[PDB]
Assembly symmetry: C5
């Protein structure tokens, strides 16, 4: 009787996880937060490589790295806590005492970092037509709502597909509205800056586009092959891999690029 | 079980128990809480040279509060996760005696340090007119401590004895009004003799300070805010913990930022 | 069969601690080490605000140790007493080791010398000799702690040795108080009325705060089986120890930073 | 003994168990490992200004490496101590299922970060002649990632499936010799133009880079380096973890130290 | 059946540790790693109190602090976790599930710090007839051997008195060599510096000499009275170790930071 719990638990409570499935998910989750802390050191140490007016970028990246590190750390410990090795069957099964696994830790992280990552770009690029304050608010309203909704939905990823997908959809709505506004910003930013700067913003968009799309992919990860192929421990491994890749990208790499764009203008 | 003078969370967790969502959300939000604090710290440290030397005590005090909050909020979080365990038979989280009872005391005492720091740091940005610096500082510190110490007491009796609960709570409320009376008196005098940019910020700092500080007494009473009503359940717990976290973030981080920003405009 | 252990354990192994008693003591102890780390940040950031800066450094050195040890204490408290669902009280849990204020005490081995030796980097002595005033502070400082450290193991198993070492320790205490007075005075010489007013406030603080420790030492026996030979005695002791440590190290170091400004 | 695709440490730990020396050493050597990482981190962060502004990216990258290695090598050590417990009856450390199985995985995924960094950093200290910056970088990265990933997979079969083990191992090696080649090509193109001091360092760096990195494969096969012979036991585990440590200290710390000197002698 | 372990375990697995014996060891071990983190701060916040050419010493002192901190911390957690209170007899006995206790953590700590400590002095003083490098390699080769040889032996400090002494002896030989070299390093160090600086170098030599001697004293502790093969011997050993480590790294480092100031 799990209830509204993540499908990792249902997998752990029945089939269990193999050494490879458990270990990899464990390592990939550790790598996640180890990367975040490394990223922090990088942003701080490179604060003096850019002018004074672009530094609020590096700062926000650093703030995000911290936030991320703590929650990705909690998340990794949640994984290892919630699944124990069964010596008589050689598999890792749900361990009631260590609490049920939940990705909500990561989600609420987003609630902090999304608004940060979308806002910090406004400190490097200048807006031609659109208004700083307005673009920000939209980013923040859509950003928050996008997570709050998705956060709510993922609870029902097994106990209720309908609610799962409805919320997932309402979330998706706001998602595109961010993409829209971002593309808008990227352009107005390319207006009046060295080709080098322009090239960097372009690569930032590709990165922002791919990475941010991976998230909803992981949100559905379990069903992307209808009790198919990804409704198993393979689906769990995949989901966490994507998540970790997504974070490293949409945070660290994203921030690095913005740091270079800040130097190109500096 | 026999709990005695314990917080209302423990009685819910010792009877109904907590549903996955209720327990997980509370666990998450409490984690977000202390994550934000350490992040905010990084911000306040790195934005120190963004303001004159005379205003840098503000940022410094903000950074101090951050560390303060991080440690205690961290403790308050681990107090949650360890005081409630999953029951595989009914799939709900129930009071785990060995992990110590849950108490919001860690947080309350977090304030005992910070309430003074927050009321004090604004005095390193603004300048008064008819009020003595120390005179204000003292009234803050006295009313600040008395407010918390009296509330800290009462919240031990929120379940075991409502009359004491409300009495101590009320006595605390008195000191609460006094601190508002004074802080409003301080933002007026502070607004006198400054620019238009600062004038606007402090007006924002006020409403913020107002809404966020009112939340606390709201959370204090949470359970009893709908008469065995609707909030005398796990929902009441979720609400409370959410409210605290939002507030704590606002009262120290947003608040800290607004002040730190106001120091820049100078 | 406890043996030479703090009276927290005897209370915990018999009456047990009530929610309020165990929680408050647990909270106050947490606050304790929280304040230390917070302070660490303060003293590292205010270093600017050059000859005096060794003061801020030493304060920071105290903060670090304080945090690490006061933290250990808190965890020692929480892991040594467990809630009993049947009677609803926190009783001694052996597996988590017996409680002991020994962590605090050894913290003092470090902090006491530093706190004393640091004021010498702000004020300027008249006729007294820097290195001499230092050695006294250190020899006495160390002895005061080592002796009291020994005595507190007997605060229950042997009321005599407890008081003997206690008394001995108290000798070094008064000594230190004497020297520190000789420093406050010689410091007041040749500085604005502000610089003085500060050192005066430092004296009162240092006097009151440092007297709280020996009060805590006897806290159990400050009302004769009295009112303070119970959980309330444990609360009190730990409240006092935290109040002192915050005053003697943080507020203290802050006042030395302010005097370091007027100068 | 139904372990599955697990490292040979568990197979020893669940059968013969580890003696005091064997378990303790491994435990110590692992801890020293992540201690050196945090020690070195400080060194790089404090020597940032001892080199001109264009070379500093090296110092900074080394610092980043140090942090990751710290955490993951920490996790690794905690993995070892949690996965084996003393048995009073026979005084030997045996596998403790509750504390999860042991797996060097933590260290491997460490490399995912650190291998690209260590390779990409030297390109901030030296100047190239024929081959271009980006081209060298991407071959380092692509190859680096593949090498680690194919090795990471293979080590899961170091017992359950000897073939798949050696197969991937070899596949990894391919990407390895590729990295060696492209590196010596960089060391050389680097020596060109710089003082006999910098040139002297690069020489030293190469020696290091070659040895240190060769040690990894050595660890990979540690158990099978003496056939069921002598290294299929607790000693084999000791030897492996010792090597992994020596190798990680050399490949990242000593290495980054040398790239620091080089950055100095090029100011 | 413990096998090749430190006598701490044999005492804890037989006699048991009294509240005091256990609590003190626990405290002193904590104090140890606490001092290390405090020292770190000091050496960081005082880097700028000396000329650039000397600063390397401060940094190396800080490095050592970090290393020491962690490993001492581990050592502390190893002590506390390895021995549990027995409420029925009122003493602390070996808890198998917490791993056996071992000083090995500390020894491997030295495997780093020793090199750094002998090395860092070369960034303050100036030799006269010996080369910077030669002296550094003599230190390092010997410093390593001394630690490894001793690390081995301490595993047999009960199971095998012979191997214990044999390795300890072999280790000592390298110890003397380091005293010889370090002696030559201080004499040449005094050449060409104010008598004030000379005096600090003298103190340093005594500190170095005394504190570094303590270690083999601890190594043997148990057998230093054929009332020391008890819990008292354990207390003694751990106190000495801590005193030594504080002295040989912190105080040592401070005195060098002062010699850097005088020479600035
Ligand atoms: C283990 C913690 C390491 C994370 C990095 C913390 C930030 C370090 C700040 C370094 C700043 C150096 C500036 C000169
Ligand atoms: C877990 C590590 C996060 C703690 C944040 C510590 C902030 C250090 C900032 C260093 C500032 C260096 C200035 C350049
Ligand atoms: C959580 C621990 C935070 C306290 C240690 C942070 C110390 C680094 C701040 C000083 C950096 C200088 C800023 C200019
Ligand atoms: C818990 C120990 C964390 C300290 C390790 C090193 C962190 C780097 C901060 C040093 C900043 C140097 C400033 C010059
Ligand atoms: C938690 C203890 C932190 C000790 C190391 C941090 C030192 C950073 C301050 C350096 C400022 C110059
Ligand atoms: Na697990
Ligand atoms: Na729990
Ligand atoms: Na407890
Ligand atoms: Na173990
Ligand atoms: Na114990």
């Amino acid at each position: 009787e799990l209830g509204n719990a993540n499908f990792e638990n249902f997998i752990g409570a029945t089939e269990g996880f193999s050494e490879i499935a458990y270990q990899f998910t464990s390592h990939i989750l550790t790598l996640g937060y180890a990367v975040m802390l490394a990223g922090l050191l990088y942003f701080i140490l490179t604060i003096k490589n850019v002018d004074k007016k672009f530094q609020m970028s590096n700062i926000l990246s650093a703030v995000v790295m911290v936030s991320a590190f703590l929650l990705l750390y909690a998340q990794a410990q949640n994984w290892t806590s919630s699944f124990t090795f069964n010596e008589e069957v050689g598999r890792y099964f749900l361990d009631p005492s260590g609490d049920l696994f939940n990705n909500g830790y990561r989600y609420l992280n987003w609630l902090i970092d999304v608004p940060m990552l979308l806002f910090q770009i406004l400190f490097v690029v200048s807006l031609t037509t659109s208004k700083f304050s307005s673009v920000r608010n939209q980013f923040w309203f859509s950003g928050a709502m996008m997570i709050i909704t998705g956060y709510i939905g993922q609870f029902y990823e097994v106990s209720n597909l309908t609610a799962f997908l409805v919320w997932g959809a309402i979330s998706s709505a706001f998602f595109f509205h961010i993409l829209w506004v971002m593309k808008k910003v990227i352009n107005e930013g390319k207006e009046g800056i060295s080709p080098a700067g322009q090239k960097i913003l372009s690569n930032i968009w590709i990165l922002f586009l791919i990475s941010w799309t991976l998230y909803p992919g992981a949100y559905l990860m379990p069903y992307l092959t209808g009790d198919g192929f990804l409704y198993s421990e393979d689906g769990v491994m995949a989901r966490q891999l994507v998540y970790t890749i997504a974070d490293v990208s949409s945070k660290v790499i994203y921030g690095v690029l913005l740091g270079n764009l800040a130097i190109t203008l500096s």
